[PDB]
Amino acid sequence: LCPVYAPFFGAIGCASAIIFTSLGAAYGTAKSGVGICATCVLRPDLLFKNIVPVIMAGIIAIYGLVVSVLVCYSLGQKQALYTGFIQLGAGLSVGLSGLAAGFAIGIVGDAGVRGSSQQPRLFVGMILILIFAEVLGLYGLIVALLLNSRATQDVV
Amino acid sequence: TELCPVYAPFFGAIGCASAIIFTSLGAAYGTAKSGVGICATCVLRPDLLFKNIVPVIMAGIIAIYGLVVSVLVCYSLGQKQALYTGFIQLGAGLSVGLSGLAAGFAIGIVGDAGVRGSSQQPRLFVGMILILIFAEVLGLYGLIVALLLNSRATQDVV
Amino acid sequence: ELCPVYAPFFGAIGCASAIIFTSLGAAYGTAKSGVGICATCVLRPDLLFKNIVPVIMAGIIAIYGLVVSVLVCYSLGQKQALYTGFIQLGAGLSVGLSGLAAGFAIGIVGDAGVRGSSQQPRLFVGMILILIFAEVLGLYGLIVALLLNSRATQDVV
Amino acid sequence: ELCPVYAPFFGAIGCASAIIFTSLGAAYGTAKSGVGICATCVLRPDLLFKNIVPVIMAGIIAIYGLVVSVLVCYSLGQKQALYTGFIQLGAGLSVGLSGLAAGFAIGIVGDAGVRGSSQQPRLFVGMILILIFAEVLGLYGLIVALLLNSRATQDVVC
Amino acid sequence: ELCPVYAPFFGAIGCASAIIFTSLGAAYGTAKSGVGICATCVLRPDLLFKNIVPVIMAGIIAIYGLVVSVLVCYSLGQKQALYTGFIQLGAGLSVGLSGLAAGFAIGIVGDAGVRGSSQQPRLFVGMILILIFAEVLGLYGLIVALLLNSRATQDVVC
Amino acid sequence: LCPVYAPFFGAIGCASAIIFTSLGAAYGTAKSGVGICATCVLRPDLLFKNIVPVIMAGIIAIYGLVVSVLVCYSLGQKQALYTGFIQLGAGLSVGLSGLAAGFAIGIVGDAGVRGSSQQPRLFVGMILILIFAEVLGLYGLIVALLLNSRATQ
Amino acid sequence: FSHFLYYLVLIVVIVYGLYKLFTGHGSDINFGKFLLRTSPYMWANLGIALCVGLSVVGAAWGIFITGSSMIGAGVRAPRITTKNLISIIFCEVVAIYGLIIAIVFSSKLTVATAENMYSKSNLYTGYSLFWAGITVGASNLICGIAVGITGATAAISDAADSALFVKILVIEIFGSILGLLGLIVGLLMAGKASEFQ
Amino acid sequence: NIYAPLYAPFFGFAGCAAAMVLSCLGAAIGTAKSGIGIAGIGTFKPELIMKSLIPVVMSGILAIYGLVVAVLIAGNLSPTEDYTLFNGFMHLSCGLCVGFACLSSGYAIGMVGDVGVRKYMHQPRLFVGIVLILIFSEVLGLYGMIVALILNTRGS
Amino acid sequence: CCTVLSAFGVVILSVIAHLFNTNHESFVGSINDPEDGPAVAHTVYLAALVYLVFFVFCGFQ
Amino acid sequence: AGLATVVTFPFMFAIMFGDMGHGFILFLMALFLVLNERKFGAMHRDEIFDMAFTGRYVLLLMGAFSVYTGLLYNDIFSKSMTIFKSGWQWPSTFRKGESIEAKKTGVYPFGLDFAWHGTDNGLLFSNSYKMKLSILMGYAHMTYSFMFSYINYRAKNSKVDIIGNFIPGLVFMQSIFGYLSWAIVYKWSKD
Amino acid sequence: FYTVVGVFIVVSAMSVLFWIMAPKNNQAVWRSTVILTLAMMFLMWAITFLCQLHPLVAPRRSDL
Amino acid sequence: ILSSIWTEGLLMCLIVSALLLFILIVALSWISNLDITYGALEKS
């Protein structure tokens, strides 16, 4: 009921919470940085206005960090296999959804900062689409927190 | 025994190896891809050469992040160690490695695109550093996760 | 049980893998830098022994594998612990797949720097300065495997 | 148990690999550099016996594979230790998959060197210099395999 | 226990591989070089029989495979040692996957050699010398398999 | 003799007999319907005589439907492995045959309805080619309906 | 991504084989007992179904290869569209080969008694029908594709000049030797195989 | 009998199938790839077609090479006689070393005898060299058939 | 070229027939070798005469 | 280098091409060109036959040495020659179909022994003999052609080249592979 | 082994007797061909004699 | 017995469902490669 190979799933859930959110945040930072460093050569005044897709990418990695710390502080040697399965699910829920949120933030941020220098009114539309792209990772954060709140609830 | 079998240091050796392997892959991509941009934008602008080496220093910090966790997992290996210890040493190794790999990809892509266009506009130098900080905290987060996993490797083990 | 019959398998795979992947990385770093040299000094052959630095720094990370694949080779016994085989496999992989990355980085920076250093004469200092950061990757892998291999037979039974 | 029946399998596929993966790197170093000789000596045929040094240094690593395959072959037996089979597999892989790398490096460097040594004759001494570094990669694998094969049947029992 | 019933499987696939991969390499060496022969003897008809030497050079590889496969075939037995099957599998792979390499090398060298030898008459001796360096790889594989096959059934027992 | 896993093969044969046949019929409808839509923008009076390839692709799917219906009336909880694997063979036969025949009707049909608008003598040609590709579904239907008759004997 | 799965399955097979071999249990990966204990009706019905399936996927393959080029080549020269239908016919006969072998194989498919079910003859006639269905379906596949290619070249060389179709029909004859040779070999393989008894 | 198990004809009928399928695959590649080159010169000098049918005939001989060994494996298979596993492995090997032999020889004949026939419309002196390279590429399957016949007579 | 092959067919097959006739151990001495020596020599010597007929007929060409 | 080639090239050929049957065929088709060199000299030679007739004396030696070395081996169209007295006798009374060994009586006078022909482990002995034969003849060829470098540096009167290249080359080659070639002979000398 | 030295004496004395009695027309190819061919014939004879002087492997066959 | 997990019936369900899934992947890769000739549908 609480076997020896049970914290393997918890360690993979602690790893995958930060690994895939860092992959998503790294895709978002790379795409948005290629966008910024190609749109702020000619328009350097709106350089610090365009760093918002990179911040939205970094909040995805913060979401992964929080879940990985909370799964890390619930590991144990003699824990249940249910706890390991819930921690694996909570790691994957935030990781493979923050990866998708990072893909969306990178694509929207590149396409929005390459066209926001031409049209100044497109910035409040880019922020509005990136809010919907960052709520995609906030949903995985909520699912991971609700899973990890029940990892040790009625456990023998 | 049962809690501490014979194949338990396998996961610890893989966690000690992967933490330096994948951070060396990430740091190598961040060095090579962003050094192409240094060696391409110096044949016309050679005076900014010691300041365009920011994306190779910020990529070599990722390899130091891998080195620290590889040393700390290496000094926690034992023959009769727990299987939980090997499991979360593998977890710490993967948390540093596969996140420092992504940090190295982001540092390489952003640093190439930044030193390619920073020779044209001099005001982009303060921008590409601010983007590379967000690209390097991705590996700093994996460093924090592995340093929290490594503080539990032999804590309440039997 | 602590020293099984299949225990030298992981040590032999580590002793092979220590030199195999560093030879692949050194081969990539020598091959691309040699193409860069042989394409950059058909016009300016005075920079022939100057541009040999990427080939040397790619050849050093194969000596990094040759060190650990001798130090692992001289700790291989028939009745050795499985812990020793696991550490020797981890050490072989830690040198090999890090010197492979170091060789990739040296091979890209080497021809990208010797094709551009024929135009700008003071890109050579920057090329050396980037190749040092590309060669300390293999140095870090060497440090990790030398710290592993000093523990493979420390308190084994 | 200590010398099982399947123990000569690893010794046989270590005797086989040290010529297979060595000769299919020597073949790359011969072919990729020979298409650079046959395409260059149509205009400079006086350099024909001087540009053939990449083919010779690609043939030397196959002799490096041949020596280790013979020395692994003459240490095979029906009742040999499984340690001996593991060591012979390690020696065969150490020669083969590093002579493959040395052959890839000789093949990529050699045609770039012989196509460039006919425009500038002072690049031949640079081609030899790069090609010695490309060719010592197989000599390192031969050193590792000979130090393995000297350890193969030293203190074996049963 | 020492001469099992599934033991001739390895010798059978070793006898098969020394024809399979060797004929594959010889077929590559005949096909890719015959493309160059038929492409250059359109306007150079008198060099039609000097250019067959890549194709003959690749056929000697298949003769090398034929000899080793027949000599393995005349040592397959029903009550065969598993050591003997392992040695015959190693000797089959050592001819097959090295004759494949030598066939790749002859096929890539020989078409460039017959394309350059129609333009330069002094490149023929260089083509023959590079093809000797390419055929000696399959010769090395045959040497390894004949030294290996001679050790099958020396001290076999049970 | 009649195990618990024996109606897996019959149920998956009944599945595949309509799945692979509908994949072939969908390729034969879509690829030959692209040719109908591309042809009938410059010569629209050939619209209802070029409709024959999608009709033949539909006949293929009817041939697969027949085998799926006739397999699912012989399934039971306690059938043997003989019945199970013979229903599997009856599914695979009409599946691969309808898939092949539908691919062939799709690739011949759009080329035929494109050549029929340039040369009017190619309508009889494309019909006589598509009739050979139609009966390949019959050639799998024969083996399917023969293996159906040996289900419970 | 498919190369990643090809490498992953290979790594899992090597790790599982070496784990099973190192722990002294390497005979548990037992392909002979797998052949002895699987039902012969699987091999028999799978051989029949793959015979009639892979004959048809070669026949239909050749039919579109020499059908689409026949219709393309018939736009300028419409006097090929009936004479050259023998190239459809030569690649269509490889399906009737597989059909008349699948029915002859299914005649050998009866109900075997459970007391002699994994016997010598019942297992022999599962193996024989399996590989004699494979060697007919694959041979008719390859023959249908070869006759389709050599009919697609013939359909364009016919529209070039009328006297070339007679010369290049011979290549279709030598290509259609192959399905008849598979027809022969699949009848010789299941020639001594009895019914399931 | 422990040397003649009941799963041994699996590897004999596998030898039949590997001797037939791969040899007719090589024969089909050799006749189709070369018929492409023969029909390619159908308009340019049509009189050189009936002389150039030799790489089709030499490709068709490669199917006879597989036919002979498929008949000779299928003649040694009977459900009433004893059939050793040695015999089954030997028939698997003799079909497997003729199938890939004829496959490689058919690839070689197909790659040689269409380039040769396709360049033969320019130079009429190519034909002796074409026939010679086809003989060198057609003895590749004869080598495998010799190995298969010796191996069949050895294994029975 | 048939006269060269026929002259070698005289010489080689005559030596082989003589080595079968005298029971030489490189031709009869094994178990897999034929048992009766002169029974094989009688059918190799006739082939030597057949190749001698080919050598005489192609020697007047 | 074409004055030591005149013997060593047909002889290194014959070590690889060792057979009295194929060697006599090659010697005969070379002697056909040597005896008819006056009718073939005043003739237009195409490139392959110009190659074959320009070397009508390389092939005569390549056949004449191939007959010698295929008389050293027992290889006459891959058959043995029972010319001399054997050094191995087989047992007289033995069961049919069993594996037997031969007892050494003496040593075979000229060449390899004919009791290794239909032999299971005869190919192991031929592998050992031909491998050590190749090692010793390669050693002899290399240490013969290395003395020509000393004769060159002596004719150039350059003691600097002698002490810099020949002597450190000589006592590097002879101290390793001269020792190997001596050790093969000394293992053959002991029982 | 002394029947190898006894053949080396009669080969070496013959080669020395031919070095001084070579024809004057083509000296550097008479005393170079004949003296080197006696050396290589003696070398292959000595190698094929010493491999059978004290053998380690006995000839072993089944069919006789 | 063959195995307890990988029994005689599971391991030949996973061969049938691998052959069928192979045919499915091949056929879906055929239908995925199906493109429309857009130039014969536009005005231009």
mmCIF file of C-alpha atoms in Angstrom, chain A:
data_model
loop_
_atom_site.group_PDB
_atom_site.id
_atom_site.type_symbol
_atom_site.label_atom_id
_atom_site.label_comp_id
_atom_site.label_asym_id
_atom_site.label_seq_id
_atom_site.Cartn_x
_atom_site.Cartn_y
_atom_site.Cartn_z
ATOM 1 C CA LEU A 1 0.000 0.000 0.000
ATOM 2 C CA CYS A 2 3.025 2.226 0.679
ATOM 3 C CA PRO A 3 5.778 0.488 -1.327
ATOM 4 C CA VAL A 4 9.462 1.281 -1.760
ATOM 5 C CA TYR A 5 9.236 2.548 -5.368
ATOM 6 C CA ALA A 6 6.560 5.098 -4.341
ATOM 7 C CA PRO A 7 8.735 8.285 -4.104
ATOM 8 C CA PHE A 8 9.940 7.691 -7.687
ATOM 9 C CA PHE A 9 6.654 9.102 -8.975
ATOM 10 C CA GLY A 10 6.942 11.986 -6.521
ATOM 11 C CA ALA A 11 10.481 12.791 -7.648
ATOM 12 C CA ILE A 12 9.373 12.705 -11.294
ATOM 13 C CA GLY A 13 6.445 14.953 -10.364
ATOM 14 C CA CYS A 14 8.834 17.346 -8.633
ATOM 15 C CA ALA A 15 11.157 17.343 -11.651
ATOM 16 C CA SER A 16 8.485 17.637 -14.374
ATOM 17 C CA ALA A 17 6.825 20.597 -12.643
ATOM 18 C CA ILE A 18 9.882 22.788 -13.243
ATOM 19 C CA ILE A 19 11.298 21.053 -16.368
ATOM 20 C CA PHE A 20 8.366 21.543 -18.726
ATOM 21 C CA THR A 21 7.433 24.979 -17.384
ATOM 22 C CA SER A 22 11.058 26.006 -17.950
ATOM 23 C CA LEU A 23 10.847 24.601 -21.498
ATOM 24 C CA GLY A 24 7.685 26.639 -22.103
ATOM 25 C CA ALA A 25 9.169 29.766 -20.545
ATOM 26 C CA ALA A 26 12.338 29.241 -22.608
ATOM 27 C CA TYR A 27 10.365 29.004 -25.845
ATOM 28 C CA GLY A 28 8.445 32.141 -24.888
ATOM 29 C CA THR A 29 11.580 34.064 -23.905
ATOM 30 C CA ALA A 30 13.397 32.999 -27.088
ATOM 31 C CA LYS A 31 10.564 33.882 -29.500
ATOM 32 C CA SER A 32 9.779 37.146 -27.706
ATOM 33 C CA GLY A 33 13.474 38.062 -27.522
ATOM 34 C CA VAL A 34 13.934 37.526 -31.257
ATOM 35 C CA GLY A 35 10.872 39.741 -31.681
ATOM 36 C CA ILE A 36 12.153 42.498 -29.367
ATOM 37 C CA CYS A 37 15.725 42.503 -30.704
ATOM 38 C CA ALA A 38 14.357 42.847 -34.257
ATOM 39 C CA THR A 39 11.676 45.470 -33.521
ATOM 40 C CA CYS A 40 13.678 47.686 -31.127
ATOM 41 C CA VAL A 41 16.596 48.341 -33.473
ATOM 42 C CA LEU A 42 14.579 51.104 -35.146
ATOM 43 C CA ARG A 43 12.235 51.890 -32.210
ATOM 44 C CA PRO A 44 14.338 51.878 -29.011
ATOM 45 C CA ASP A 45 11.908 54.015 -26.981
ATOM 46 C CA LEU A 46 9.378 51.173 -26.686
ATOM 47 C CA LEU A 47 12.030 48.637 -25.633
ATOM 48 C CA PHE A 48 10.872 48.473 -21.999
ATOM 49 C CA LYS A 49 7.244 48.407 -23.158
ATOM 50 C CA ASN A 50 7.839 45.179 -25.121
ATOM 51 C CA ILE A 51 9.388 43.148 -22.267
ATOM 52 C CA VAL A 52 5.899 42.100 -21.125
ATOM 53 C CA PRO A 53 5.811 38.803 -23.160
ATOM 54 C CA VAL A 54 9.114 37.875 -21.494
ATOM 55 C CA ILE A 55 7.605 38.627 -18.064
ATOM 56 C CA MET A 56 4.519 36.564 -18.975
ATOM 57 C CA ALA A 57 6.898 33.755 -19.926
ATOM 58 C CA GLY A 58 8.762 34.034 -16.605
ATOM 59 C CA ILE A 59 5.542 33.833 -14.573
ATOM 60 C CA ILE A 60 5.000 30.372 -16.136
ATOM 61 C CA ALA A 61 8.345 29.228 -14.714
ATOM 62 C CA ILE A 62 7.375 30.760 -11.358
ATOM 63 C CA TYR A 63 4.168 28.670 -11.529
ATOM 64 C CA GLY A 64 6.289 25.577 -12.101
ATOM 65 C CA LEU A 65 8.669 26.532 -9.273
ATOM 66 C CA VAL A 66 5.835 26.887 -6.728
ATOM 67 C CA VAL A 67 4.371 23.451 -7.517
ATOM 68 C CA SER A 68 7.809 21.824 -7.520
ATOM 69 C CA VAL A 69 8.620 23.306 -4.082
ATOM 70 C CA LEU A 70 5.262 22.178 -2.660
ATOM 71 C CA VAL A 71 5.753 18.658 -4.067
ATOM 72 C CA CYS A 72 9.355 18.653 -2.766
ATOM 73 C CA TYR A 73 8.226 19.420 0.790
ATOM 74 C CA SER A 74 5.730 16.524 0.739
ATOM 75 C CA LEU A 75 8.130 13.761 -0.317
ATOM 76 C CA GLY A 76 9.154 10.984 2.027
ATOM 77 C CA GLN A 77 10.656 7.532 2.109
ATOM 78 C CA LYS A 78 7.683 5.736 3.683
ATOM 79 C CA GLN A 79 4.930 7.527 1.784
ATOM 80 C CA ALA A 80 2.002 5.957 -0.016
ATOM 81 C CA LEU A 81 1.812 5.092 -3.695
ATOM 82 C CA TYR A 82 -1.327 7.239 -3.867
ATOM 83 C CA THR A 83 0.770 10.217 -2.739
ATOM 84 C CA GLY A 84 3.349 9.515 -5.446
ATOM 85 C CA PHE A 85 0.656 9.212 -8.123
ATOM 86 C CA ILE A 86 -0.984 12.480 -7.017
ATOM 87 C CA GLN A 87 2.398 14.250 -7.002
ATOM 88 C CA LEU A 88 3.139 12.899 -10.501
ATOM 89 C CA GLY A 89 -0.251 14.159 -11.687
ATOM 90 C CA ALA A 90 0.303 17.557 -10.048
ATOM 91 C CA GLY A 91 3.725 17.837 -11.647
ATOM 92 C CA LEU A 92 2.493 16.943 -15.122
ATOM 93 C CA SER A 93 -0.632 19.134 -14.795
ATOM 94 C CA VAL A 94 1.396 22.281 -14.258
ATOM 95 C CA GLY A 95 4.299 21.252 -16.512
ATOM 96 C CA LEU A 96 2.651 20.185 -19.748
ATOM 97 C CA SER A 97 0.146 23.040 -19.475
ATOM 98 C CA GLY A 98 2.793 25.674 -18.772
ATOM 99 C CA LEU A 99 4.635 24.309 -21.804
ATOM 100 C CA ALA A 100 1.562 25.049 -23.929
ATOM 101 C CA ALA A 101 1.100 28.446 -22.256
ATOM 102 C CA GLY A 102 4.742 29.218 -23.058
ATOM 103 C CA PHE A 103 4.278 28.188 -26.697
ATOM 104 C CA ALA A 104 1.244 30.489 -26.952
ATOM 105 C CA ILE A 105 3.005 33.379 -25.163
ATOM 106 C CA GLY A 106 6.033 33.047 -27.453
ATOM 107 C CA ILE A 107 4.041 32.950 -30.696
ATOM 108 C CA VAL A 108 1.620 35.742 -29.680
ATOM 109 C CA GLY A 109 4.441 37.866 -28.253
ATOM 110 C CA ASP A 110 6.622 37.567 -31.357
ATOM 111 C CA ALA A 111 3.698 38.344 -33.682
ATOM 112 C CA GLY A 112 2.586 41.208 -31.439
ATOM 113 C CA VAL A 113 5.885 42.993 -30.912
ATOM 114 C CA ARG A 114 6.735 42.713 -34.607
ATOM 115 C CA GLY A 115 3.487 44.508 -35.456
ATOM 116 C CA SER A 116 3.095 46.774 -32.438
ATOM 117 C CA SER A 117 5.871 49.052 -33.688
ATOM 118 C CA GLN A 118 3.850 49.686 -36.851
ATOM 119 C CA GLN A 119 0.520 50.188 -35.048
ATOM 120 C CA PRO A 120 0.757 51.663 -31.517
ATOM 121 C CA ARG A 121 -2.826 50.624 -30.701
ATOM 122 C CA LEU A 122 -1.961 46.907 -31.018
ATOM 123 C CA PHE A 123 -0.225 46.887 -27.610
ATOM 124 C CA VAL A 124 -3.462 46.746 -25.599
ATOM 125 C CA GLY A 125 -4.585 43.893 -27.841
ATOM 126 C CA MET A 126 -1.311 42.010 -27.393
ATOM 127 C CA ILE A 127 -1.607 42.354 -23.599
ATOM 128 C CA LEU A 128 -5.192 41.091 -23.797
ATOM 129 C CA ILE A 129 -4.244 38.007 -25.832
ATOM 130 C CA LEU A 130 -1.262 37.287 -23.563
ATOM 131 C CA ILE A 131 -3.602 37.376 -20.551
ATOM 132 C CA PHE A 132 -5.611 34.545 -22.147
ATOM 133 C CA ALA A 133 -2.342 32.763 -22.925
ATOM 134 C CA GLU A 134 -1.077 33.083 -19.316
ATOM 135 C CA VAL A 135 -4.388 31.948 -17.786
ATOM 136 C CA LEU A 136 -3.673 28.652 -19.624
ATOM 137 C CA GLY A 137 -0.779 28.112 -17.216
ATOM 138 C CA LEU A 138 -2.729 29.527 -14.278
ATOM 139 C CA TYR A 139 -5.268 26.728 -14.869
ATOM 140 C CA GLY A 140 -2.542 24.100 -14.587
ATOM 141 C CA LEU A 141 -1.367 25.852 -11.424
ATOM 142 C CA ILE A 142 -4.892 25.592 -9.967
ATOM 143 C CA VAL A 143 -5.167 21.894 -10.892
ATOM 144 C CA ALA A 144 -1.718 21.209 -9.410
ATOM 145 C CA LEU A 145 -2.562 23.017 -6.155
ATOM 146 C CA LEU A 146 -5.887 21.188 -5.800
ATOM 147 C CA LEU A 147 -4.159 17.853 -6.451
ATOM 148 C CA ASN A 148 -1.325 18.575 -4.006
ATOM 149 C CA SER A 149 -3.823 19.629 -1.328
ATOM 150 C CA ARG A 150 -5.147 16.037 -1.435
ATOM 151 C CA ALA A 151 -1.841 14.152 -1.733
ATOM 152 C CA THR A 152 -1.832 13.433 2.022
ATOM 153 C CA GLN A 153 -5.461 13.761 3.121
ATOM 154 C CA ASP A 154 -6.678 10.298 4.231
ATOM 155 C CA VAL A 155 -3.501 8.259 3.784
ATOM 156 C CA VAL A 156 -2.579 5.021 5.544
#
